[model samples]
Target chain A: GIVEQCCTSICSLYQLENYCN
Target chain B: FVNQHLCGSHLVEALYLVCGERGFFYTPKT
Candidate 1:
């Protein structure tokens, strides 16, 4: 599921940023 | 967060993510 991978990777970036605080 | 995301959508986000400082910030709320 490449599409899923793309979505997860994109989403993970934002999620990772959210953890910055 | 220590800093902000100053990236242009015309470019890739991965590079932007790498060009940032990864650290912890503690702010006091009064």
Candidate 2:
């Protein structure tokens, strides 16, 4: 869950789905 | 000066997002 949250936050900035995954 | 400026901005942004998701306030420590 923390990782998902981190990815979501990062994706909001960079818009990278791969990174979010 | 330059390194401090760049890293500081990124650190703040990351903390802001992380804390927001966690439903916590981002308070800088002294």
Instruction: Give the proportion of true interface contacts each model preserves, from 0 to 1.
Output: 0.10, 0.00
Residue range B1-30, candidate 2, lDDT tens digits? 011221334544654554454443333334
Residues A1-21, candidate 1, lDDT per residue (tens digit)? Answer: 222333333334443344343
Native A-B contact fraction in model 1: 0.10
TM-score of each: 0.22, 0.29
- The C-alpha stretches of model 2 lying farther than 4 A from their native spots are A1-21, B1-6, B21-30
RMSD per candidate (Å) reads 13.0, 11.1
**Best-fitting candidate, scored by TM-score:** 2
List of clashing residue pairs for candidate 2: none
TM-score of chain A in every predicted structure? 0.25, 0.25
What's the CA error at residue A5 for candidate 2, in Å? 22
